[PDB]
Design a protein around this nucleic acid. Structure first.
Ligand SMILES: [Mg+2]
Ligand SMILES: [Mg+2]
Ligand SMILES: [Mg+2]
Ligand SMILES: [Mg+2]
Ligand SMILES: [Mg+2]
Ligand SMILES: [Mg+2]
Ligand SMILES: [Mg+2]
Ligand SMILES: [Mg+2]
Ligand SMILES: [Mg+2]
Ligand SMILES: [Mg+2]
Ligand SMILES: [Mg+2]
Ligand SMILES: [Mg+2]
Ligand SMILES: [Mg+2]
Ligand SMILES: [Mg+2]
Ligand SMILES: [Mg+2]
Ligand SMILES: [Mg+2]
Ligand SMILES: [Mg+2]
Ligand SMILES: [Mg+2]
Ligand SMILES: [Mg+2]
Ligand SMILES: [Mg+2]
Ligand SMILES: [Mg+2]
Ligand SMILES: [Mg+2]
Ligand SMILES: [Mg+2]
Ligand SMILES: [Mg+2]
Ligand SMILES: [Mg+2]
Ligand SMILES: [Mg+2]
Ligand SMILES: [Mg+2]
Ligand SMILES: [Mg+2]
Ligand SMILES: [Mg+2]
Ligand SMILES: [Mg+2]
Ligand SMILES: [Mg+2]
Ligand SMILES: [Mg+2]
Ligand SMILES: [Mg+2]
Ligand SMILES: [Mg+2]
Ligand SMILES: [Mg+2]
Ligand SMILES: [Mg+2]
Ligand SMILES: [Mg+2]
Ligand SMILES: [Mg+2]
Ligand SMILES: [Mg+2]
Ligand SMILES: [Mg+2]
Ligand SMILES: [Mg+2]
Ligand SMILES: [Mg+2]
Ligand SMILES: [Mg+2]
Ligand SMILES: [Mg+2]
Ligand SMILES: [Mg+2]
Ligand SMILES: [Mg+2]
Ligand SMILES: [Mg+2]
Ligand SMILES: [Mg+2]
Ligand SMILES: [Mg+2]
Ligand SMILES: [Mg+2]
Ligand SMILES: [Mg+2]
Ligand SMILES: [Mg+2]
Ligand SMILES: [Mg+2]
Ligand SMILES: [Mg+2]
Ligand SMILES: [Mg+2]
Ligand SMILES: [Mg+2]
Ligand SMILES: [Mg+2]
Ligand SMILES: [Mg+2]
Ligand SMILES: [Mg+2]
Ligand SMILES: [Mg+2]
Ligand SMILES: [Mg+2]
Ligand SMILES: [Mg+2]
Ligand SMILES: [Mg+2]
Ligand SMILES: [Mg+2]
Ligand SMILES: [Mg+2]
Ligand SMILES: [Mg+2]
Ligand SMILES: [Mg+2]
Ligand SMILES: [Mg+2]
Ligand SMILES: [Mg+2]
Ligand SMILES: [Mg+2]
Ligand SMILES: [Mg+2]
Ligand SMILES: [Mg+2]
Ligand SMILES: [Mg+2]
Ligand SMILES: [Mg+2]
Ligand SMILES: [Mg+2]
Ligand SMILES: [Mg+2]
Ligand SMILES: [Mg+2]
Ligand SMILES: [Mg+2]
Ligand SMILES: [Mg+2]
Ligand SMILES: [Mg+2]
Ligand SMILES: [Mg+2]
Ligand SMILES: [Mg+2]
Ligand SMILES: [Mg+2]
Ligand SMILES: [Mg+2]
Ligand SMILES: [Mg+2]
Ligand SMILES: [Mg+2]
Ligand SMILES: [Mg+2]
Ligand SMILES: [Mg+2]
Ligand SMILES: [Mg+2]
Ligand SMILES: [Mg+2]
Ligand SMILES: [Mg+2]
Ligand SMILES: [Mg+2]
Ligand SMILES: [Mg+2]
Ligand SMILES: [Mg+2]
Ligand SMILES: [Mg+2]
Ligand SMILES: [Mg+2]
Ligand SMILES: [Mg+2]
Ligand SMILES: [Mg+2]
Ligand SMILES: [Mg+2]
Ligand SMILES: [Mg+2]
Ligand SMILES: [Mg+2]
Ligand SMILES: [Mg+2]
Ligand SMILES: [Mg+2]
Ligand SMILES: [Mg+2]
Ligand SMILES: [Mg+2]
Ligand SMILES: [Mg+2]
Ligand SMILES: [Mg+2]
Ligand SMILES: [Mg+2]
Ligand SMILES: [Mg+2]
Ligand SMILES: [Mg+2]
Ligand SMILES: [Mg+2]
Ligand SMILES: [Mg+2]
Ligand SMILES: [Mg+2]
Ligand SMILES: [Mg+2]
Ligand SMILES: [Mg+2]
Ligand SMILES: [Mg+2]
Ligand SMILES: [Mg+2]
Ligand SMILES: [Mg+2]
Ligand SMILES: [Mg+2]
Ligand SMILES: [Mg+2]
Ligand SMILES: [Mg+2]
Ligand SMILES: [Mg+2]
Ligand SMILES: [Mg+2]
Ligand SMILES: [Mg+2]
Ligand SMILES: [Mg+2]
Ligand SMILES: [Mg+2]
Ligand SMILES: [Mg+2]
Ligand SMILES: [Mg+2]
Ligand SMILES: [Mg+2]
Ligand SMILES: [Mg+2]
Ligand SMILES: [Mg+2]
Ligand SMILES: [Mg+2]
Ligand SMILES: [Mg+2]
Ligand SMILES: [Mg+2]
Ligand SMILES: [Mg+2]
Ligand SMILES: [Mg+2]
Ligand SMILES: [Mg+2]
Ligand SMILES: [Mg+2]
Ligand SMILES: [Mg+2]
Ligand SMILES: [Mg+2]
Ligand SMILES: [Mg+2]
Ligand SMILES: [Mg+2]
Ligand SMILES: [Mg+2]
Ligand SMILES: [Mg+2]
Ligand SMILES: [Mg+2]
Ligand SMILES: [Mg+2]
Ligand SMILES: [Mg+2]
Ligand SMILES: [Mg+2]
Ligand SMILES: [Mg+2]
Ligand SMILES: [Mg+2]
Ligand SMILES: [Mg+2]
Ligand SMILES: [Mg+2]
Ligand SMILES: [Mg+2]
Ligand SMILES: [Mg+2]
Ligand SMILES: [Mg+2]
Ligand SMILES: [Mg+2]
Ligand SMILES: [Mg+2]
Ligand SMILES: [Mg+2]
Ligand SMILES: [Mg+2]
Ligand SMILES: [Mg+2]
Ligand SMILES: [Mg+2]
Ligand SMILES: [Mg+2]
Ligand SMILES: [Mg+2]
Ligand SMILES: [Mg+2]
Ligand SMILES: [Mg+2]
Ligand SMILES: [Mg+2]
Ligand SMILES: [Mg+2]
Ligand SMILES: [Mg+2]
Ligand SMILES: [Mg+2]
Ligand SMILES: [Mg+2]
Ligand SMILES: [Mg+2]
Ligand SMILES: [Mg+2]
Ligand SMILES: [Mg+2]
Ligand SMILES: [Mg+2]
Ligand SMILES: [Mg+2]
Ligand SMILES: [Mg+2]
Ligand SMILES: [Mg+2]
Ligand SMILES: [Mg+2]
Ligand SMILES: [Mg+2]
Ligand SMILES: [Mg+2]
Ligand SMILES: [Mg+2]
Ligand SMILES: [Mg+2]
Ligand SMILES: [Mg+2]
Ligand SMILES: [Mg+2]
Ligand SMILES: [Mg+2]
Ligand SMILES: [Mg+2]
Ligand SMILES: [Mg+2]
Ligand SMILES: [Mg+2]
Ligand SMILES: [Mg+2]
Ligand SMILES: [Mg+2]
Ligand SMILES: [Mg+2]
Ligand SMILES: [Mg+2]
Ligand SMILES: [Mg+2]
Ligand SMILES: [Mg+2]
Ligand SMILES: [Mg+2]
Ligand SMILES: [Mg+2]
Ligand SMILES: [Mg+2]
Ligand SMILES: [Mg+2]
Ligand SMILES: [Mg+2]
Ligand SMILES: [Mg+2]
Ligand SMILES: [Mg+2]
Ligand SMILES: [Mg+2]
Ligand SMILES: [Mg+2]
Ligand SMILES: [Mg+2]
Ligand SMILES: [Mg+2]
Ligand SMILES: [Mg+2]
Ligand SMILES: [Mg+2]
Ligand SMILES: [Mg+2]
Ligand SMILES: [Mg+2]
Ligand SMILES: [Mg+2]
Ligand SMILES: [Mg+2]
Ligand SMILES: [Mg+2]
Ligand SMILES: [Mg+2]
Ligand SMILES: [Mg+2]
Ligand SMILES: [Mg+2]
Ligand SMILES: [Mg+2]
Ligand SMILES: [Mg+2]
Ligand SMILES: [Mg+2]
Ligand SMILES: [Mg+2]
Ligand SMILES: [Mg+2]
Ligand SMILES: [Mg+2]
Ligand SMILES: [Mg+2]
Ligand SMILES: [Mg+2]
Ligand SMILES: [Mg+2]
Ligand SMILES: [Mg+2]
Ligand SMILES: [Mg+2]
Ligand SMILES: [Mg+2]
Ligand SMILES: [Mg+2]
Ligand SMILES: [Mg+2]
Ligand SMILES: [Mg+2]
Ligand SMILES: [Mg+2]
Ligand SMILES: [Mg+2]
Ligand SMILES: [Mg+2]
Ligand SMILES: [Mg+2]
Ligand SMILES: [Mg+2]
Ligand SMILES: [Mg+2]
Ligand SMILES: [Mg+2]
Ligand SMILES: [Mg+2]
Ligand SMILES: [Mg+2]
Ligand SMILES: [Mg+2]
Ligand SMILES: [Mg+2]
Ligand SMILES: [Mg+2]
Ligand SMILES: [Mg+2]
Ligand SMILES: [Mg+2]
Ligand SMILES: [Mg+2]
Ligand SMILES: [Mg+2]
Ligand SMILES: [Mg+2]
Ligand SMILES: [Mg+2]
Ligand SMILES: [Mg+2]
Ligand SMILES: [Mg+2]
Ligand SMILES: [Mg+2]
Ligand SMILES: [Mg+2]
Ligand SMILES: [Mg+2]
Ligand SMILES: [Mg+2]
Ligand SMILES: [Mg+2]
Ligand SMILES: [Mg+2]
Ligand SMILES: [Mg+2]
Ligand SMILES: [Mg+2]
Ligand SMILES: [Mg+2]
Ligand SMILES: [Mg+2]
Ligand SMILES: [Mg+2]
Ligand SMILES: [Mg+2]
Ligand SMILES: [Zn+2]
Lengths: 122, 131, 118, 204, 59, 13
RNA sequence: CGUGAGGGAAAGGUGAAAAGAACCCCGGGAGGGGAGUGAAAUAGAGCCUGAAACCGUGGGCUUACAAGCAGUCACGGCCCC
RNA sequence: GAAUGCCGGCAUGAGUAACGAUAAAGAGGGUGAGAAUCCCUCUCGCCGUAAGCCCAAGGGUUCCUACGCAAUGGUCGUCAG
RNA sequence: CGAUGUCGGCUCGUCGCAUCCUGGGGCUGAAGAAGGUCCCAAGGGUUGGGCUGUUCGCCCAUUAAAGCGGCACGCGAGCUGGGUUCAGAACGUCGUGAGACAGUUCGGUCUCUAUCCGCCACGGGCGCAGGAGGCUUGAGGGGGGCUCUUCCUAGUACGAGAGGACCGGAAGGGACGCACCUCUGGUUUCCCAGCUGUCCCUCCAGGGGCAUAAGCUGGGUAGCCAUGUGCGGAAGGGAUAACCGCUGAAAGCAUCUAAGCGGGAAGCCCGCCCCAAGAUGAGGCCUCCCACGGCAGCCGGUAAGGACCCGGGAAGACCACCCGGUGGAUGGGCCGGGGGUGUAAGCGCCGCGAGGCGUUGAGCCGACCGGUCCCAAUCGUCCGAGGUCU
């Protein structure tokens, strides 16, 4: 459950370590982003000579949340952090690897490249 | 009129009786029916059960696993039809009903805190010897 | 709201309310019959019935349980040896409440008697 | 239009097509028609239904008469369904098949004297920064000399709940005729044990 | 607050009109089947001490 | 818009 | 009242005569009801006269679809002489 | 008939706010016309570098006992500075 | 001027329309898509941030859009008190000076009690010419009214190309609304356990008080809840706006109009939901009692019924509403189940001991779902028609 001011871990090798959400791209006035939703964020922490650098305003999709997400089969899943993957305007990952599990919900939302790259899909 | 009975009656067609008993602290492997398009397959989720919240047909249990460097928790309905089976992989000895506290512990610390439940382990091997 | 909530508050915090019940229990078990306000009376029944029912058990466990509220060994001896036996075949309802006709002068409080049953 | 009286028994979820579906169980049948309203006699069309059977020791003489004229055992609740005229002398759950959408009416839970925040979702006041005893207050309630008064209907604190509420277009998930049971998907107004009315939906 | 205050003296009519709901309801009483004395129902009779047929209390 | 006050802030009696 | 210098009130009347109500009754008392005193006791000491605001009990007329500085003019109903 | 006049009396607001630290009460037995409130007993709670004890200021019989409850006591009162 | 509190914010709205969006149009230097400009339209909607006391404005990220005004520049007996009108102090500047400055700077007492109208809720009374118990009609009111993306049609019409539809159809959302507690997630003042210090019972063991109005800590049922769940905006009928017509004179042509008839909006009327016969215009249906005794009135006891009283209640401030009162499951006990806690005490064994193991998912155990007359709703009382006249 992500909103502006929320810090996200970035789960790729774009060079970003930590991004802070500044807007959730979902209608006129959405309050929260969950898995599969796209946010606009600021790169608050990066590592030297990456693609992205601190201060960059980037787009990203949420792949993990500490707030458990509920599923039609009556089950839920919850992660230890809130994590995102930095993308381009074509919803494609800018990196070449994604680290850690991702929510299966990404699949139904057309983020196949990230799902494929993900080491595990839960 | 017995309102409680009516509900139990509605629920009865959906009740399961084929799953093994397990406690918070046990290490369990839940084989879950997962859909990915357009075929469905069985995905295994294995971790410590940190919570069981009982409510008859509506009890649910929560299993916790560390997956590729990230902690993952999964809530399952105890009578969900998407559970193929559940395999007790290990009996764990807890001293409380909810084990949320293990979220802040190292792998070493969890291990010392959840000693193997030797009594129920023996009980497991004591059965499984059948006619 | 108060939907499906059980238990009066009797304008006392948690520990005072407990003491109130415990003290009334000691007095009831001691004199067999006391006079209180109607609300206090109606609330005392359950608290004392449980204590009596445990005396009906008889075992060490029950004695030590009852001792938590009654706190007095002699009074508990009376409970197990003289009170409990006459309720051997009774299924609950070891206490009764009957309302008096006159209110307190100083505050108009309606009164009631609480007594152990025959 | 068709309908039945019933008591709300409780909530659960059942599984259907690998989906968890929240349900409210309703004991609907059986409801004897005890009077029929006719355009010739009553000026409109509806059926007075009875529900739940009543200890005759409690049925007064005018009520006794009413039931007797219909050849009907004493019932606890009398209620009409508008523009509904069943062929039989008894309405049961079977008038609904699974898959139909229905409208359920009940008496909502009562919040008693409700504040303006609970009742009307007002924001109330700040909890620090100087806020002075107005944390759950409604703020201004008007203008000044013009108009010099307060509108009728001004949202204010007051009683809330214990009122007729109809939620609409609920899926009938299942019906169990041998137990006079209806399983409706989602939520139904009022407490368990409350009397509800199940009508065929007016949504298209 | 800014100290609200009555704007006009209340008339004798309006003051007495307010009190149109102030009259006491007489005590509800019934005869005690034993001593025929009048007492509130569902209370132990304070005159003979009887309730539900039996002597319960010393008067 | 900012205009000058026409009354002082009320002092105690 | 003010540390103080100093400031500074309110408060008169039974009856001619106490003859100031023995005694009895209800009441813990207060208070009252009889008895008694007196020309007179709503002159009974909370006492001459006892206005008004104000409070109350009883009776007559009137009032719960009506718009107001409360009255005034007309007519009708009810009550009284 | 008015001077936010002066003195006094009585109203309205009103059976309304409040009854002065949220340390806390319960029962049984006495007394008495009358008892939540006075006496006794048991249970419970609060203070304990005090909310205990001893001085000095200041106060001036408030001390002890008997007999009392009109007023003083923010209720009651048989109790009391 | 014997006082009409003054900027901005917050809260709560409501109105206007010179319309920001959404809907409907005409013209276009309108190919398509997208704009421009004007007309109709006030139903709903009109985001979150950085800076400043700011209104305003600039900026960031979005959006269908990020409208402009009135309501004492709406709203301080509603809150704030940053701005600004007191007393302190300082800077620049002016003045010999005391002091002063639409120049600046730091600080600086915002009043428990609502009489009347108005508003939100809830009752009492009387009325609706028999007196009653139910079930209803709906005059008239109120609520609601938003919108986007993607896919199909179709890479089709249009276009060199880039780009890319009308109409029709399908799915998925944001914000808001009503209800709900199965799930998710809260709380859960004593439901369970662990723990420290002290005092105590009774020495050990086992317990109790206090450490908060839970000592602390880990959990936690019912209830009440949102972050959780269901559902809503319509569909549809009708009459219209701008606008477009058919037929058609005056005026042999022409003309939407002068006779007449169509089409046409998120708007209007109905439809949906809720209130509602004090609708004194007091409605309707079903059923019950009934022709009482004494002189359109009075008195006396009744009938159908009702009230009082009591046990209670997801009903509730009181009142009301609703259920029940022994011909009874209403509450309280008790029992069974659920649920919570997570293996009581006691004993036995192991260890020098702290402890460990077994007995044992034990012991304890609020509210939830039921059962059971063990306790209590004993016994009763009082109101309550006799039906006005054409
Ligand atoms: Mg990572
Ligand atoms: Mg930098
Ligand atoms: Mg950038
Ligand atoms: Mg039941
Ligand atoms: Mg249930
Ligand atoms: Mg059954
Ligand atoms: Mg089960
Ligand atoms: Mg079950
Ligand atoms: Mg190690
Ligand atoms: Mg073993
Ligand atoms: Mg509360
Ligand atoms: Mg209850
Ligand atoms: Mg309660
Ligand atoms: Mg309690
Ligand atoms: Mg009390
Ligand atoms: Mg209180
Ligand atoms: Mg405590
Ligand atoms: Mg005795
Ligand atoms: Mg009583
Ligand atoms: Mg009395
Ligand atoms: Mg008193
Ligand atoms: Mg009484
Ligand atoms: Mg009709
Ligand atoms: Mg029809
Ligand atoms: Mg509240
Ligand atoms: Mg609330
Ligand atoms: Mg609400
Ligand atoms: Mg707020
Ligand atoms: Mg706010
Ligand atoms: Mg808030
Ligand atoms: Mg303040
Ligand atoms: Mg303040
Ligand atoms: Mg505060
Ligand atoms: Mg306010
Ligand atoms: Mg004002
Ligand atoms: Mg006006
Ligand atoms: Mg209500
Ligand atoms: Mg649908
Ligand atoms: Mg109903
Ligand atoms: Mg204040
Ligand atoms: Mg007044
Ligand atoms: Mg006046
Ligand atoms: Mg006056
Ligand atoms: Mg008044
Ligand atoms: Mg008067
Ligand atoms: Mg009796
Ligand atoms: Mg200014
Ligand atoms: Mg002095
Ligand atoms: Mg002096
Ligand atoms: Mg005089
Ligand atoms: Mg003289
Ligand atoms: Mg003289
Ligand atoms: Mg005497
Ligand atoms: Mg005497
Ligand atoms: Mg005396
Ligand atoms: Mg005398
Ligand atoms: Mg006398
Ligand atoms: Mg004489
Ligand atoms: Mg004489
Ligand atoms: Mg003479
Ligand atoms: Mg006299
Ligand atoms: Mg006289
Ligand atoms: Mg005279
Ligand atoms: Mg005289
Ligand atoms: Mg004289
Ligand atoms: Mg005189
Ligand atoms: Mg006089
Ligand atoms: Mg006079
Ligand atoms: Mg009079
Ligand atoms: Mg009228
Ligand atoms: Mg009239
Ligand atoms: Mg008038
Ligand atoms: Mg006038
Ligand atoms: Mg006139
Ligand atoms: Mg005339
Ligand atoms: Mg003059
Ligand atoms: Mg004055
Ligand atoms: Mg004045
Ligand atoms: Mg003067
Ligand atoms: Mg004068
Ligand atoms: Mg005066
Ligand atoms: Mg009052
Ligand atoms: Mg008042
Ligand atoms: Mg009040
Ligand atoms: Mg008060
Ligand atoms: Mg005090
Ligand atoms: Mg005071
Ligand atoms: Mg006090
Ligand atoms: Mg107190
Ligand atoms: Mg006594
Ligand atoms: Mg004596
Ligand atoms: Mg005596
Ligand atoms: Mg006393
Ligand atoms: Mg007394
Ligand atoms: Mg006493
Ligand atoms: Mg006291
Ligand atoms: Mg202390
Ligand atoms: Mg010490
Ligand atoms: Mg200390
Ligand atoms: Mg001295
Ligand atoms: Mg002195
Ligand atoms: Mg002596
Ligand atoms: Mg006194
Ligand atoms: Mg006294
Ligand atoms: Mg006295
Ligand atoms: Mg004296
Ligand atoms: Mg006194
Ligand atoms: Mg005082
Ligand atoms: Mg004395
Ligand atoms: Mg003394
Ligand atoms: Mg002025
Ligand atoms: Mg004035
Ligand atoms: Mg003024
Ligand atoms: Mg002004
Ligand atoms: Mg003013
Ligand atoms: Mg505010
Ligand atoms: Mg604010
Ligand atoms: Mg705010
Ligand atoms: Mg307005
Ligand atoms: Mg506005
Ligand atoms: Mg216009
Ligand atoms: Mg313009
Ligand atoms: Mg704009
Ligand atoms: Mg448009
Ligand atoms: Mg437009
Ligand atoms: Mg347009
Ligand atoms: Mg063009
Ligand atoms: Mg065109
Ligand atoms: Mg073009
Ligand atoms: Mg132009
Ligand atoms: Mg255009
Ligand atoms: Mg323009
Ligand atoms: Mg223009
Ligand atoms: Mg509009
Ligand atoms: Mg409007
Ligand atoms: Mg507007
Ligand atoms: Mg903003
Ligand atoms: Mg800002
Ligand atoms: Mg900042
Ligand atoms: Mg700022
Ligand atoms: Mg600004
Ligand atoms: Mg501007
Ligand atoms: Mg500016
Ligand atoms: Mg657009
Ligand atoms: Mg903005
Ligand atoms: Mg703007
Ligand atoms: Mg603008
Ligand atoms: Mg304008
Ligand atoms: Mg505006
Ligand atoms: Mg304005
Ligand atoms: Mg202006
Ligand atoms: Mg303004
Ligand atoms: Mg203003
Ligand atoms: Mg403005
Ligand atoms: Mg404005
Ligand atoms: Mg103002
Ligand atoms: Mg203020
Ligand atoms: Mg202001
Ligand atoms: Mg004002
Ligand atoms: Mg400042
Ligand atoms: Mg100035
Ligand atoms: Mg300074
Ligand atoms: Mg100079
Ligand atoms: Mg100079
Ligand atoms: Mg010069
Ligand atoms: Mg000057
Ligand atoms: Mg200025
Ligand atoms: Mg100036
Ligand atoms: Mg400035
Ligand atoms: Mg400054
Ligand atoms: Mg300061
Ligand atoms: Mg300043
Ligand atoms: Mg300031
Ligand atoms: Mg002031
Ligand atoms: Mg205050
Ligand atoms: Mg008040
Ligand atoms: Mg008032
Ligand atoms: Mg007024
Ligand atoms: Mg009013
Ligand atoms: Mg009424
Ligand atoms: Mg009314
Ligand atoms: Mg009529
Ligand atoms: Mg008539
Ligand atoms: Mg009726
Ligand atoms: Mg209508
Ligand atoms: Mg009307
Ligand atoms: Mg309407
Ligand atoms: Mg409307
Ligand atoms: Mg295509
Ligand atoms: Mg192409
Ligand atoms: Mg192409
Ligand atoms: Mg294709
Ligand atoms: Mg085509
Ligand atoms: Mg082509
Ligand atoms: Mg293309
Ligand atoms: Mg389309
Ligand atoms: Mg609702
Ligand atoms: Mg719930
Ligand atoms: Mg639940
Ligand atoms: Mg829950
Ligand atoms: Mg939960
Ligand atoms: Mg929790
Ligand atoms: Mg306990
Ligand atoms: Mg305890
Ligand atoms: Mg404790
Ligand atoms: Mg623990
Ligand atoms: Mg310890
Ligand atoms: Mg201890
Ligand atoms: Mg020990
Ligand atoms: Mg211990
Ligand atoms: Mg104890
Ligand atoms: Mg202690
Ligand atoms: Mg403690
Ligand atoms: Mg202590
Ligand atoms: Mg304490
Ligand atoms: Mg807790
Ligand atoms: Mg709970
Ligand atoms: Mg929500
Ligand atoms: Mg039409
Ligand atoms: Mg043409
Ligand atoms: Mg033509
Ligand atoms: Mg025409
Ligand atoms: Mg014409
Ligand atoms: Mg037309
Ligand atoms: Mg056409
Ligand atoms: Mg729409
Ligand atoms: Mg109605
Ligand atoms: Mg209705
Ligand atoms: Mg009516
Ligand atoms: Mg009606
Ligand atoms: Mg009627
Ligand atoms: Mg009709
Ligand atoms: Mg006859
Ligand atoms: Mg008869
Ligand atoms: Mg006669
Ligand atoms: Mg009868
Ligand atoms: Mg309630
Ligand atoms: Mg009640
Ligand atoms: Mg009542
Ligand atoms: Mg009843
Ligand atoms: Mg009875
Ligand atoms: Mg009976
Ligand atoms: Mg029976
Ligand atoms: Mg029961
Ligand atoms: Mg029971
Ligand atoms: Mg109860
Ligand atoms: Mg159950
Ligand atoms: Mg269990
Ligand atoms: Mg063990
Ligand atoms: Mg053990
Ligand atoms: Mg050994
Ligand atoms: Mg050994
Ligand atoms: Mg040993
Ligand atoms: Mg075993
Ligand atoms: Mg149990
Ligand atoms: Mg039960
Ligand atoms: Mg039975
Ligand atoms: Mg019984
Ligand atoms: Mg009668
Ligand atoms: Mg009568
Ligand atoms: Mg007659
Ligand atoms: Mg005739
Ligand atoms: Zn008697």
């Amino acid at each position: 459950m992500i909103q502006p001011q929320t810090y996200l871990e970035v789960a790729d090798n774009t060079g970003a370590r930590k991004i802070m959400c500044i807007r959730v791209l979902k209608g006129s006035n959405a309050k929260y982003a969950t898995v599969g939703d796209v946010i606009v964020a600021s790169v608050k922490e990066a590592i030297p000579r990456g693609a992205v650098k601190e201060g960059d305003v980037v787009k990203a999709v949420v792949v993990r949340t500490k707030k458990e997400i509920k599923r039609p089969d009556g089950s839920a899943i919850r992660f230890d952090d809130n994590a995102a993957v930095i993308i381009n305007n074509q919803l494609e990952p800018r990196g070449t690897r994604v680290f850690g599990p991702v929510a299966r919900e990404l699949r139904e939302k057309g983020f196949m490249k990230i799902v494929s790259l993900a080491p595990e899909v839960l | 009129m017995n309102r409680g009975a009516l509900i139990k009656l509605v629920e009865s067609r959906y009740v399961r009786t084929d799953l093994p008993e397990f406690r918070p602290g046990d290490t369990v492997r839940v084989s879950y029916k997962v859909k990915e398009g357009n075929r469905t397959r069985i995905q295994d989720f294995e971790g410590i059960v940190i919570r069981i919240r009982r409510n008859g047909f509506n009890t649910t249990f929560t299993v916790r696993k560390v997956s590729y460097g990230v902690g993952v928790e999964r809530i399952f309905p105890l009578h969900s039809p998407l559970i193929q089976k559940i395999d007790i992989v290990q009996r764990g000895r807890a001293r409380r009903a909810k084990l949320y506290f293990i979220r802040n512990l190292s792998d070493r610390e969890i291990r010392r805190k959840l000693r193997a439940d030797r009594k129920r382990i023996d009980q497991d091997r004591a059965a499984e010897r059948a006619a | 709201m108060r939907h499906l909530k059980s238990g009066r508050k009797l304008n006392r915090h948690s520990s005072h309310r407990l003491a109130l019940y415990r003290n009334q229990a000691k007095s009831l078990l001691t004199h067999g019959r006391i006079t209180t306000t109607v609300p206090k009376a109606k609330e005392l029944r359950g608290f004392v019935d449980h204590l009596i029912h445990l005396a009906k058990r008889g075992d060490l466990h029950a004695r030590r349980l009852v001792l938590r509220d009654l706190q007095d060994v002699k009074l508990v001896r009376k409970l197990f040896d003289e009170i409990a036996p006459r309720y051997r075949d009774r299924q609950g309802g070891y206490t009764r409440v009957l309302k008096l006709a006159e209110r307190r002068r100083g505050d108009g409080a309606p009164l009631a008697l609480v007594e152990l049953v025959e | 239009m068709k309908g039945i009286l019933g008591v709300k028994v409780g909530m659960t979820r059942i599984f259907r097509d690998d989906r968890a579906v929240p349900v409210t169980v309703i004991l609907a049948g059986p409801c004897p028609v005890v009077q029929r309203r006719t355009p010739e006699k009553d000026g409109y069309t509806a059926v007075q239904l009875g529900f739940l059977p009543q200890n005759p020791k409690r049925v007064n003489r005018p009520l006794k008469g009413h039931f007797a004229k219909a050849g009907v055992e004493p019932v606890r609740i009398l209620r009409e369904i508008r523009d509904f005229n069943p062929e039989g002398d008894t309405v049961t759950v079977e008038i609904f098949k699974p898959g139909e959408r229905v409208d359920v009416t009940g008496t909502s839970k009562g919040r008693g004297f409700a504040g303006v925040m609970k009742r009307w979702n007002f924001a109330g006041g700040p909890d620090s920064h100087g806020a002075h005893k107005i944390h759950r207050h409604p703020g201004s309630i008007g203008n000044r000399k013009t108009p010099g008064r307060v509108y009728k209907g001004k949202k204010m604190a007051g009683h809330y709940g214990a009122e007729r509420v109809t939620v609409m277009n609920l899926e009938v998930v299942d019906v169990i005729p041998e137990e006079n049971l209806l399983l409706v998907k989602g939520a139904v107004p009022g407490p368990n044990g409350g009397l509800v009315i199940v009508r065929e939906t007016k949504k298209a | 607050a800014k100290h609200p205050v009555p704007k006009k003296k209340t008339s004798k009519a309006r003051r007495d009109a307010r009190r149109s709901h102030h009259a006491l309801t007489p005590p509800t009483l019934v005869p005690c089947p034993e001593c025929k004395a009048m007492k509130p129902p569902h209370t132990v009779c304070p005159e003979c001490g009887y309730y539900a047929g039996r002597k319960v209390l010393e008067v | 818009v900012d205009k000058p006050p026409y009354l002082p802030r009320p002092r105690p009696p």
